[PDB]
UniProtKB/Swiss-Prot annotation, chain A:
Subunit (UniProt): Component of the TTT complex composed of TELO2, TTI1 and TTI2. Interacts with ATM, ATR, MTOR, PRKDC, RUVBL2, TTI1, TTI2, SMG1 and TRRAP. Component of the mTORC1 and mTORC2 complexes. Interacts (phosphorylated form) with PIH1D1 which mediates interaction of TELO2 with the R2TP complex composed of RUVBL1, RUVBL2, PIH1D1, and RPAP3.
Further comment: Cells overexpressing TELO2 are hypersensitive to hydroxyurea (HU) and undergo apoptotic death in response to treatment with HU.
Associated clinical condition: You-Hoover-Fong syndrome: A syndrome characterized by severe global developmental delay, intellectual disability, dysmorphic facial features, microcephaly, abnormal movements, congenital heart disease comprising developmental abnormalities of the great vessels, and abnormal auditory and visual function. The transmission pattern is consistent with autosomal recessive inheritance.
UniProt gene name: TELO2
Post-translational modification: Hydroxylation by PHD3 is required for a proper interaction with ATR, and activation of the ATR/CHK1/p53 pathway following DNA damage. Phosphorylation by CK2 only takes place when TELO2 is bound to mTORC1, not mTORC2; leading to selective ubiquitination of mTORC1-associated protein.
Described function: Regulator of the DNA damage response (DDR). Part of the TTT complex that is required to stabilize protein levels of the phosphatidylinositol 3-kinase-related protein kinase (PIKK) family proteins. The TTT complex is involved in the cellular resistance to DNA damage stresses, like ionizing radiation (IR), ultraviolet (UV) and mitomycin C (MMC). Together with the TTT complex and HSP90 may participate in the proper folding of newly synthesized PIKKs.
Organism encoding this protein: Homo sapiens (Human)
Protein name, UniProt field: Telomere length regulation protein TEL2 homolog
Taxonomic superkingdom: Eukaryota
Subcellular location(s) per record: Cytoplasm; Membrane; Nucleus; Chromosome, Telomere
Modified positions (Hydroxyproline) in chain numbering: P353
Length: 394, 217
């Protein structure tokens, strides 16, 4: 039935015939059997739409000329696989003139279909696949597509910035949709989200990420608790761990907004394990920290208060870091910068009792450190540290 | 950084591989572990033997274990996906061989099965020529190898995977699927459908079908 019709349409077609065929999808009335069957049908039809591209410029149905283009937009009222193939043909080029129009269209259609885009991502959340690593691969490509369009460049138009905005809006939508109450308790929400998140980060830091983040943050913060926490939590990958490290720092740069909101973002979620891992990862390293001074401080604050004594360990850990010799021989001057920051935070908070025991270590530290740094070019840099410590346990 | 660069000593011989094992196993299971390793390795995908090394380091020295299965999985998958996403001749044929080795360590160590065999159905499907087969069984860690041999749901997964297609990956997937003889039955019907698609193919999907047809025969 379906297959036969498809073949017939692809082979030969008069005006009325073509019209009826197109209207086929509209009628549907075949549950999802028709859907999956037609998913394959439309895959073929999209290839047939490459052939339809030349048939669209062959003076076919002048009145409804955009309809068949709207039949391609009827595909755009479909599945992400097809969006899949949208990208496929996008890669495919060919239709130069017609494709320019196509992709132009594709793009704004897909502003709506990015909603639809990640509602198909949300639909994947609602659904599931055992061999879906390639779904993710495709998804990755789809994520990449904004930059793959850039990659395609060729003519090129609406940019990745807007990709920026697109992304932001999509996310928002998703989030709230999901929120529902909890009409979507499945974790795949977070899965897609995080997949995307990871991808995003990988793909691009600074601007993109941050902008998205900022808006998102604000909104989210303002109105969410369990849900907030959930998405946050949901965050993943190793690429995305440091992805998130970077993300977090992007958000740090997100400054005081980031501070209060990520006091709430840490309050959304710290959940032990990986958080701890990357916290110390970050602790160890590195580059730029005026943001983190503030960064450091607030981050610390948040996490520390989320889960007490984290700080303590870090503080304890930090003592060791103050040392030199090998380190005196080694490093650049960034380490010192880091050190200073640490000092400041440390001064700020703990228990009191803390002082005493840590003072054991402090004293120890102090002594060896003293020697080493007493040997500091930036003799005063080292001295400043001493004074801080001194103060700390007078 | 040093180590990374270093993996190319003029006098490799046996001492070299011994030491390869040494550094990989030196990583063992510390802090950054899998993650750190992964990072540097991913950068210069020129050293998946070191990937194997550290894979195996984790395999005989660790923690977070199904999580390490996941790490492994990630790296593994990545490797295959990139590498087998195109082609090679001198160096990267051997890179694929090295990938088989890292798959090995991983697979065995984790009994990972889900992660592992998503990547086996992937990686197994990768086999191709000579060395391929060798590596395949090796990584497979016989139990699961034969498990897959039995397996038909995985086969169906692969069937549709191939249906979507990409290139030669799909082609040889079908090839080894056939190799993995048992009893089509259901697969026979599925492949009839494949053929139909196969038949249809105007582009290189045409040669895909050619190889498929051979398999079918």
């Amino acid at each position: 039935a379906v297959r036969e019709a498809i073949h017939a349409l692809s082979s030969s077609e008069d005006g009325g015939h073509i019209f009826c065929t197109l209207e086929s999808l509209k009628r549907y009335x075949x549950x999802x059997x028709x859907x999956x069957x037609x998913s394959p049908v439309l895959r073929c039809l999209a290839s047939r739409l490459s052939p339809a591209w030349l048939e669209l410029x062959x003076x076919x149905x002048x009145x409804x000329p955009a309809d068949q283009a709207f039949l391609v937009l009827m595909e755009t009222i479909e599945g992400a696989a097809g969006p899949s193939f949208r990208l496929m043909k996008m890669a495919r080029l060919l239709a130069r003139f017609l494709r320019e129009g196509r992709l132009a269209v594709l793009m704004e259609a897909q502003c709506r279909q990015q909603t639809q885009p990640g509602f198909i991502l949300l639909r994947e959340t609602l659904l599931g696949x055992x061999x879906x690593x390639x779904x993710x691969x495709x998804x990755x490509x789809x994520x990449x597509x904004x930059g793959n369009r850039l990659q395609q460049e060729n003519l090129a138009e609406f940019f990745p910035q807007n990709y920026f905005r697109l992304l932001g809006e999509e996310v928002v939508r998703v989030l709230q949709a999901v929120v529902d109450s909890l009409q979507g308790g499945l974790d795949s929400s977070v899965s897609f989200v995080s997949q995307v998140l990871g991808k995003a980060c990988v793909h691009g830091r600074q601007q993109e990420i941050l902008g998205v983040l900022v808006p998102r943050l604000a909104a989210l913060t303002q109105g969410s608790y369990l849900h907030q926490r959930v998405c946050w939590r949901l965050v993943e990958q190793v690429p995305d761990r440091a992805m998130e490290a970077v993300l977090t720092g992007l958000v740090e740069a997100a400054l005081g907004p980031e501070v209060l909101s990520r006091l709430l973002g840490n309050l959304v979620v710290k959940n032990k394990k990986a958080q701890f891992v990357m916290t110390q990862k970050l602790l160890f390293l590195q580059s730029r920290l005026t943001t983190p001074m503030l960064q450091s401080l607030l981050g610390h604050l948040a996490m520390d208060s989320q889960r007490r004594p984290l700080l303590l360990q870090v503080l304890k850990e930090l003592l060791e870091t103050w040392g030199s010799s090998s380190a005196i021989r080694h490093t650049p001057l960034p380490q010192q910068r880091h050190v200073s920051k640490a000092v400041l935070i440390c001064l700020a908070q703990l228990g009191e009792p803390e002082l005493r025991d840590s003072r054991d270590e402090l004293l120890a530290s102090m002594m060896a450190g003293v020697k080493c740094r007493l040997d500091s070019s930036l003799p005063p840099v080292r001295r400043l540290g001493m004074i801080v410590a001194e103060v700390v346990s007078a | 950084x040093x180590x990374x660069x270093x993996x190319x000593x003029x006098x490799x011989x046996x001492x070299x591989x011994x030491x390869x094992x040494x550094x990989x196993x030196x990583x063992x299971x510390x802090x950054x572990x899998x993650x750190x390793x992964x990072x540097x390795x991913x950068x210069x995908x020129x050293x998946x033997x070191x990937x194997x090394x550290x894979x195996x380091x984790x395999x005989x020295x660790x923690x977070x274990x199904x999580x390490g299965x996941x790490x492994x999985x990630x790296x593994x998958x990545x490797x295959x996906x990139x590498x087998x996403x195109x082609x090679x001749x001198x160096x990267x044929x051997x890179x694929x061989x090295x990938x088989x080795x890292x798959x090995x360590x991983x697979x065995x160590x984790x009994x990972x099965x889900x992660x592992x065999x998503x990547x086996x159905x992937x990686x197994x499907x990768x086999x191709x020529x000579x060395x391929x087969x060798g590596x395949x069984x090796x990584x497979x860690x016989x139990x699961x190898x034969x498990x897959x041999x039995x397996x038909x749901x995985x086969x169906x997964x692969x069937x549709x995977x191939x249906x979507x297609x990409x290139x030669x990956x799909x082609x040889x997937x079908x090839x080894x699927x056939x190799x993995x003889x048992x009893x089509x039955x259901x697969x026979x019907x599925x492949x009839x459908x494949x053929x139909x698609x196969x038949x249809x193919x105007x582009x290189x999907x045409x040669x895909x079908x050619x190889x498929x047809x051979x398999x079918x025969x």
